[model samples]
Target: ESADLRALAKHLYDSYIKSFPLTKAKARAILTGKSPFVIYDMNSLMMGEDKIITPLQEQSKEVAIRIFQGCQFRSVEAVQEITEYAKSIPGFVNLDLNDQVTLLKYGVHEIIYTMLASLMNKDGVLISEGQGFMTREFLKSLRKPFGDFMEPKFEFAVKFNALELDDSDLAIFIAVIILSGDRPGLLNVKPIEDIQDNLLQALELQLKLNHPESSQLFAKLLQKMTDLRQIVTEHVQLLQVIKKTETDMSLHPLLQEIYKDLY
Candidate 1:
């Protein structure tokens, strides 16, 4: 029976969520009046000596760097945590190396962005240990290309957060998301598909028990995966644009490894 796996999923979700630093309530305390939460470990501004940098240019450069770097760091951290989280799942360890990498490549960013909502309020996400809150209005004012890239995610996140999932639901949902067999490079999808099917079944059972009165809760939950897929696809396209631009910024090694094909 997949009961063991389901129990394992519940435990895994709780372990990660309990250990996680943010929830909506906690995030609310942190996002107060903070905008563009970026730590400029590098130069605060890349002054153009030859071309002559304006104040606007310097500000834009810093904002871009901080936002990009913040995203990179957050994505890297999420990938690390999720990697370990995946290993703790009962059947996840047995997947072949190629499949394992493929799943992570396709799923980690989606997972990270999905969890991004967990720490969000109706306005936007918290960042830099609550030093920054990228409200929808704040994000809209960002420079054309970068703001365009980020807005859809914020939009999706607001909607995703509206579902009001608890740790148990998110844990099982994340499990199903990572185990997708539809990722491009899978060598054997059958086994992964089987696991996904089993995971979904287990999630349904759990949801029933968790919300006995909500008749369509499982339907809504399944629809969320569909919604997540759409939003993540848009996010990948945004990543592709960033990678294609040949900007001087550096991406995390794991981020590069996962998105190598994009550039």
Candidate 2:
């Protein structure tokens, strides 16, 4: 049974991550601004010795606009991968369209942040491809207005990294998050619940075998899911503020679709 679960998980992980392979070189390039991931905004344009803060030769509100756009693009790209992964799970596609969309709209950010663990380090997440790291100090420097929104995620990332889950473990954990039956509206619930129960059982068994010394790791992993729900809410709340305030900034259609009515 464990082998079957591992096989499915391996199929899902390799199938998706391979398609958008953020290779080390590419990650580094993005971090350094050598890659196209960098985007300029108005506030960024004002002035800066540091190029990361410096706007592109470009200007205007789109300065902030493009930065959000870049993030949206990556998040949407990840959602696409997740969409495909969802299709592979038994009974996922059988759900009604509204239920399907609801699951993705709510869970994609959680999934995105979970996958982002690959780019996390002791201090912060890697950025700009892999050239710059977003240190906690730098984020805290962002201060009360907006910076604290991200700190919860950084805190979660640090604890999650401490779990030291391999890709195999992560794959099933991700599947459980996506297959959540609590997404508010569903024509059918039993099927979704069954799928999650199956995956969580496998994950528990896997975590048990994977980290025998830390008997609490499985409980901690479930707790992380609760943490994830809170993190997702925090992230969406931040986005709602930006959306309401920055009317001039163009919101991506894909994100608008995913985030609508959620808050």
Candidate 3:
């Protein structure tokens, strides 16, 4: 029944979005998801009760509070909206650079994960080959905004030999993390063994959602993460095979051929 409902909802939503142009060539993917009843329900009630947008905002905030009433909780969409709106609350922008970067990264992180889930495959192949690559550039392309990490490099340690840290290898490594969500970074799922740092840094990273423009970006991330999780759950076999592929580090030709091919 739920599946049938989702199918209908998907069809309706698809027809609703027929005219928008995909600015990045990969934007067509946004049309591929179920509009959760939870969102629609609250949106309806708030719009009706308030008859005013500002009041709707407060009521939605309440709805968000309830949504996050449990552990590992967050309204996902609601929190994102509120946070992004807060970013432009004037004095907030002058916070530390880490704070600002954290907001943009994590705000985008939430929505990116959601978008990823929608486009990602059970085999962890991201559907948006172009979307994945460009979004990576859109959000995390640290090189452009901050030049090369020569004097002040990334914490991943940039001083290694070519065997240790080549550009192509690093690119693939980032790809693996984005596709598989299996790597450690200031933004990775289980980055390093530092719990305190993880919470603090991760929380800071999510700040881009503190203002309005960034809110939807966060939702897109959540949608991707959900779809990604759903694909994995529905196809456990694909995931298991992928797990056994430990030696298939195709990021490096030597490693791909010597290690994965030989095995």
Candidate 4:
């Protein structure tokens, strides 16, 4: 039985590898920002320059707009990847379709933040597929509420990265996140709970075998799930504010749908 569970873990990891497929060099470039990368400055990129030298005050609005647009694009892709990965988990496909959508609607943000750990360090996160690195300081330069929204993610990422989880470990962790039965509006809960129980077992097994010396790692990872919920709660609060105040900015319809009931 353990062997079968392990095989399930492997399947989840394989799905993650196929969906994300980040190499060591690309991961390094994202974490360190050392290799050749773009900064996603639309004006500078259009002008055929790699640098943007304008004062932060003057360029903040433009920078925010571009960052929002880039993030929305990536968020859409993340949904697709997450959807495909969720279907690969052993028991996920049997749930009612509406329940499946409900789980993803609530769970996607958490999964995105977990994935972000791979592409981030204490300083910032990589964007635009590792071609663009957004520093913490640079993001802090954006106007209020806009700047405030990102700080929590950076804080969460820095701590999560300290757990030193590699892709395989993260794959099981993500499965646990998505299959959680606690997500609101679940029409069927028992099957989801059964699936999550197996996933939690797989996650514990992998953590022990992978991090033999780190006795507290499993508990620490569980704590992150709670922390992620708080972060998303704050994120939704700020997003509501941003929607009302930043009238010029736009949210993708899919993202709008995901957040529709959260507030």
- What is candidate 3's lDDT per residue for 1-263, written digit by digit as tens? 44543343333223223321211123224334312111124344344333211234433443323221210122233234434433432333454444444333333333223333332222221222322211122112222221121111111111111112222122211222222222212343332223223322332233342333444443343333344333323333332343464322112222122122110
lDDT of 1 by residue, 6-45 (tens): 6766676676675456554456445444244432222322
Q: Higher lDDT: candidate 2 or 3? A: 2
- Regions of candidate 1 where Cα sits further than 4 Å from its true position: 1-6, 23-60, 243-246
The per-prediction CA RMSD against the true structure, in angstroms, equals 6.3, 5.0, 24.4, 4.4
TM-score of each model, in listed order? 0.79, 0.79, 0.19, 0.88
In terms of TM-score, which candidate is stronger, 2 or 3? Answer: 2
- Please give, for residues 131-162, the per-residue lDDT of candidate 2 as tens digits: 44555555555524355656787778778877
Using TM-score as the measure, what is the rank order of every candidate, best first? 4, 1, 2, 3
Ranking by lDDT: 4, 2, 1, 3
Q: Kindly list the per-residue Cα lDDT of model 4 for residues 169-215, writing each as its tens digit.
A: 88899999999898888988999999998999999999998999999
Between candidates 1 and 3, the TM-score winner: 1
- Give candidate 2 regions above 4 Å deviation: 19-66
Clash totals for all models, in order?
0, 13, 32, 0
